[PDB]
Amino acid sequence: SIRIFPRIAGRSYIIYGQTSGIICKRMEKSDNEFVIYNYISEHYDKFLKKYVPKLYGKNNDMLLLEDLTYNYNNPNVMDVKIGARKRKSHTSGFFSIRGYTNSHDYKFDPDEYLTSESTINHIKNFMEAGGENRDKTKQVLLKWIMKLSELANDLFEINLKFDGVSLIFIYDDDCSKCDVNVVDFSRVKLIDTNDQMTISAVTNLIKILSELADNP
């Protein structure tokens, strides 16, 4: 019957679709996530196509979403919250890592406030599954930098407050494939300017990933 999806973070009920390449995410409190997918579809379709998993449909309170992990033999996933948290400040100042594949092995704790040193170490821990080939992990980082730098650019022209949105970083163990996408629109709001807090989150990650890519 029901196969639970292996979430990295969050609190939402998420299951595999009965069909390949789909995940079903329950909207717990309101349909606001659906309203925001549809708004972005009508007002910023290009943003939706570049950065956001496909919404294929709705079944009562379930969103049918593209499984970002589907085309991977051995996916490693990191969830980084880049939008404002509800009440708390960010564990790494401009963003909060919420989890990653194998994080329990490094005693990662999502409640722990981190220094720059510990933040960088947790991202390094996440890259460990990618093996010893410096050149291949560096190509993963550069492709993430490529898409995040375009996202930061595009966000200047989008009049949404991306409260609670996450970045889902994915790379294959063999480092042949990687991506990053924006998920979780449940608390996103209309506003009459751009979201400088969320832009600062992305530019700060671009800065951290760039030092990792340039490390000797």
Ligand SMILES: O=P(O)(O)O[C@@H]1[C@@H](OP(=O)(O)O)[C@H](OP(=O)(O)O)[C@@H](O)[C@@H](OP(=O)(O)O)[C@H]1OP(=O)(O)O
């Ligand atoms: O601090 P946040 O905003 O990163 O964390 C929220 C938390 O989000 P998440 O960890 O499920 O993504 C849950 O909120 P929802 O995203 O589910 O609405 C927690 O329930 C929420 O606590 P609360 O809903 O009981 O206020 C966390 O917020 P808070 O710790 O800032 O209060």
Ligand SMILES: Nc1ncnc2c1ncn2[C@@H]1O[C@H](COP(=O)(O)OP(=O)(O)O)[C@@H](O)[C@H]1O
């Ligand atoms: N489209 C997706 N494809 C693959 N994994 C996803 C997708 N959306 C969410 N996830 C997984 O589910 C987790 C929680 O997703 P999110 O939308 O942030 O839900 P919540 O509202 O519970 O925080 C993420 O950390 C990630 O592991």
Ligand SMILES: [Mg+2]
């Ligand atoms: Mg979330």
